[PDB]
Nucleic acid binder design. Structure first.
Lengths: 133, 22
DNA sequence: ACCTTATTTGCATAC
DNA sequence: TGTATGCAAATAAGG
């Protein structure tokens, strides 16, 4: 079984990590140093608990397997949005949930943010409003 | 009370439990 | 380019 | 201190 193979691998990976004294964050950083693709402590945690989708585990397994084999021998950084800035965006959302591209650019300029971050903030916020009904 | 953020759908953990149940 | 729906992924923090 | 997880920023793919 593919699912059972992922279960057994996650277990073997976790055991070897712990046997060597690595934290989850350590091994995520190690994978960036050695193979150029760092992952967060959060992701390592989810992988070891099988709290990722099937496709997602199948994607990461060969990367984690490179480190395990040694042990047995690209995305942009997540932008932090200040509380007062988030509240400014939220109050705008309440009366204009879908600003135009021009307005998005103006908001970014006024708030000293990147236009793409503001664009994506509104996209995600619309999706949230759907999720929470 | 409502979950605010995005959740993974169909984790391997859940799929394994679903398979082992039937 | 830039919306959509869907999903991956990481801060921040409570254990 | 290290791990789990709420919230959500970034990305994937179609139009």
């Amino acid at each position: 079984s593919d699912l059972e193979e992922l279960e057994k691998f996650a277990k073997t990976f976790k055991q070897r990590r712990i046997k060597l004294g690595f934290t989850q964050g350590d091994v995520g950083l190690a994978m960036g140093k050695l193979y150029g693709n760092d992952f967060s402590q959060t992701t390592i945690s989810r992988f070891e608990a099988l709290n990722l989708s099937f496709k997602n585990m199948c994607k990461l397994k060969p990367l984690l397997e490179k480190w395990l084999n040694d042990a047995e021998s690209k995305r942009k950084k997540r932008t932090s949005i200040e509380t007062n800035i988030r509240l400014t965006l939220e109050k705008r959302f309440q009366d204009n949930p879908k600003p135009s591209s021009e307005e998005i650019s103006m908001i970014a300029e006024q708030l000293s943010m990147e236009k793409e971050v503001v664009r994506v903030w509104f996209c995600n916020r619309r999706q949230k409003e759907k999720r929470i009904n | 009370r409502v979950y605010q953020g995005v959740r993974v759908k169909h984790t391997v953990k859940d799929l394994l439990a679903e398979k082992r149940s039937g």
